Design a binder for this molecule. Structure first.
Ligand SMILES: CO/N=C(/C(=O)N[C@@H]1C(=O)N2C(C(=O)O)=C(CSc3nc(=O)c(=O)[nH]n3C)CS[C@H]12)c1csc(N)n1
Ligand code: NI
Length: 334
């Protein structure tokens, strides 16, 4: 059945609750972002209306083939009505099109649903600050102190640097990036930027990127591999065996590959794995809050209830996160 943590109490709304068939007493459904944990169940003939950002809707429309009529896009940083409830979508600083949602219930209660997000101080200078928020549905993906990774700013600076090095050194060398779902585009876009390349890819992915309407995207991407000296390949293809296969299958224009895996302490001290003329790099590009980013965020927010939405399936997990919420409540004095 649909769990209590996917339901907005007060309304008949749900958030990312498409894998449960029809939820009883659910007048509208909300999609925070286009990630498959969060959209599973959305067939092209899903018959209830869906509320989301523009971008998430494009991806629904084109990848999952749902009809304009059942797809209600909504602008960011704007007060909107939906089944007579005030709602606002805020940028989640997650993947393209991802949003947090504020529900302003008619009784007076105000609910933030982070969805997936990467807490940032800039969110404290937002619509959020214009009132107290009582309940918080919290992306707790990394709610544990060992989870510390650097700023996206650092990683990309590094990856830009590692890139401009290897190509200025060997101008017949190819940067490659790993990828599966949307997100982490700034990695591969920022390298292409600095080497004045376009970004080559398979068509599914090219299509996926055309949904996101990035400024001047046509001039930053392509499906003809040859012309692009930075290529995106599926994450599974990012191994020495796969990168040989790829370098044969270009017609011998590139003699050396610099790869990147974006999934997973100091950044300058990072060292690759080299086997041949193939350097692979594991880089920690998160689009989720670290322990401290989250902490700061919630401690600023000072919510009354907090409802975690992630690592929710076991009691060890549930009570460990509840301990950290107690610590934060106490430390900040709310
Ligand atoms: C092939 O599958 N890939 C993995 C794997 O988990 N790789 C990376 C890893 O640890 N990752 C993490 C994360 O760290 O949370 C994540 C992020 S969790 C997540 N984030 C979302 O934004 C979202 O919408 N849904 N989810 C679930 C999943 S893959 C990546 C794998 C399987 S076996 C193996 N060696 N790794
Ligand atoms: Ni996500």
């Amino acid at each position: 059945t649909c769990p209590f943590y996917k339901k907005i109490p007060g309304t008949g709304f749900t958030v990312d609750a498409f894998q449960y068939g029809v939820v009883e007493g659910c007048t509208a459904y909300f999609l925070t972002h286009f990630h498959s944990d969060h959209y599973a169940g959305l067939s092209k003939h899903f018959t209830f209306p869906v509320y989301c950002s523009e971008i998430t809707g494009n991806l629904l429309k084109n990848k999952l083939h749902v009809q304009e009529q059942y797809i209600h896009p909504l602008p960011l940083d704007t007060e909107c009505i939906v089944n007579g409830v005030k709602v606002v979508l805020l940028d989640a600083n997650h993947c393209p099109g991802a949003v947090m949602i504020l529900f302003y219930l008619p009784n007076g209660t105000v609910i933030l649903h982070t969805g997936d997000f990467r807490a940032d101080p800039s969110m404290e200078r937002s619509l959020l600050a214009d009132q107290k928020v009582h309940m918080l549905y919290l992306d707790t993906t990394y709610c544990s102190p060992e989870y510390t990774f650097p700023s996206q700013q650092e990683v990309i600076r590094f990856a830009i640097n590692t890139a401009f090095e290897a190509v200025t050194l060997n101008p017949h060398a190819l940067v490659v990036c790993g990828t599966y779902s949307i997100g982490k585009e700034k990695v591969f876009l920022a390298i292409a930027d600095v080497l004045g390349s376009k970004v080559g890819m398979s068509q599914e992915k090219y299509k996926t990127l055309q949904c996101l309407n990035i400024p001047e995207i046509n001039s930053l991407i392509t499906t003809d591999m040859c012309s692009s000296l930075v290529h995106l390949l599926p994450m599974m293809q990012i191994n020495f065996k796969g990168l040989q296969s790829h370098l044969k299958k270009c017609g011998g224009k590139y003699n050396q590959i610099l790869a990147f895996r974006p999934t997973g302490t100091r950044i300058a001290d990072v060292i690759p794995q080299t086997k041949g003329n193939i350097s692979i790099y594991g880089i920690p590009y998160s689009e989720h809050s670290s322990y401290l980013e989250m902490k700061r965020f919630v401690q600023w927010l000072k919510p009354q209830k907090i409802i975690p939405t992630v690592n929710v399936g076991t009691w060890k997990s549930r009570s460990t996160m509840e301990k950290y919420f107690r610590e934060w409540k106490l430390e900040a004095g709310y």
